[PDB]
């Protein structure tokens, strides 16, 4: 249980508009967790396609909430969009 620990994190928007297109959404975003447990300094590293599953990423990060006294200062969460009907969240 080393490092930070997500307390309040929600899955990324799963718009059917993409399902029909049959496009696997996978973006690599990097944010920095503060001692307070609030996600900030969120910036997309690589998004391809970028204009497909990027606008529905920052919206989920701004809501995320990690533990306290355990900042990340540079995390990585591949925003996968498994067609199965779920996200990278195990």
Curated annotation (Swiss-Prot):
It comes from the Bacteria. It is found in: Cell inner membrane. Residues 2-90 form the TonB C-terminal domain. Interacts with outer membrane receptor proteins that carry out high-affinity binding and energy dependent uptake into the periplasmic space of specific substrates such as cobalamin, and various iron compounds (such as iron dicitrate, enterochelin, aerobactin, etc.). In the absence of TonB these receptors bind their substrates but do not carry out active transport. TonB also interacts with some colicins and is involved in the energy-dependent, irreversible steps of bacteriophages phi 80 and T1 infection. Homodimer. Forms a complex with the accessory proteins ExbB and ExbD. Belongs to the TonB family. This is Protein TonB. It comes from Salmonella typhimurium (strain LT2 / SGSC1412 / ATCC 700720). The chain holds residues 154 to 242 of 242 of the full protein.
């Amino acid at each position: 249980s080393t490092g930070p620990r997500a307390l309040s994190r929600n899955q990324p928007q799963y718009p059917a508009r993409a399902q029909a297109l049959r496009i696997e959404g996978r973006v690599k975003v990097k944010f920095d967790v503060t001692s307070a447990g609030r996600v900030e300094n969120v910036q997309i590293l690589s998004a391809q396609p970028a204009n497909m599953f990027e606008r529905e990423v920052k919206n989920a990060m701004r809501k995320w909430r990690y533990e306290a006294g355990k900042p990340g200062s540079g995390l990585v969460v591949n925003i996968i969009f498994r067609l199965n009907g779920t996200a990278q969240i195990e």
